[PDB]
Amino acid sequence: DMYIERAGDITWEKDAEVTGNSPRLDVALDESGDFSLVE
């Protein structure tokens, strides 16, 4: 049996940690919902 527990409000945080790059990738999506790289 799966169950849910509240973890917080959904709000934008001013001055949150800023990280991560922005890659532009060629991808395919199959019928099972799995993404894959097209190369």
Ligand X SMILES: O=C1CC[C@@H](NC(=O)c2cscn2)CN1
Pick from 31, 36, 37, 39 the residue near ligand X by CB under 6 A. 31
The CA-atom distances, in angstroms, between 16 and each of 2, 23, 25, 30 are 31, 21, 26, 35
Minimum CB–partner distance for residue 14 and other proteins (Å): 10
Measure the CA–CA gap between 28 and 26, rounded to whole angstroms: 7
32 binds ligand X (CB under 6 A): yes
Interface with ligand X, residue 36, by CB under 6 A: no
- Cross-strand partners of 36: 28
Interface ranges with other proteins (CB under 8 A) = 1-13, 16-29, 31-33, 35-37
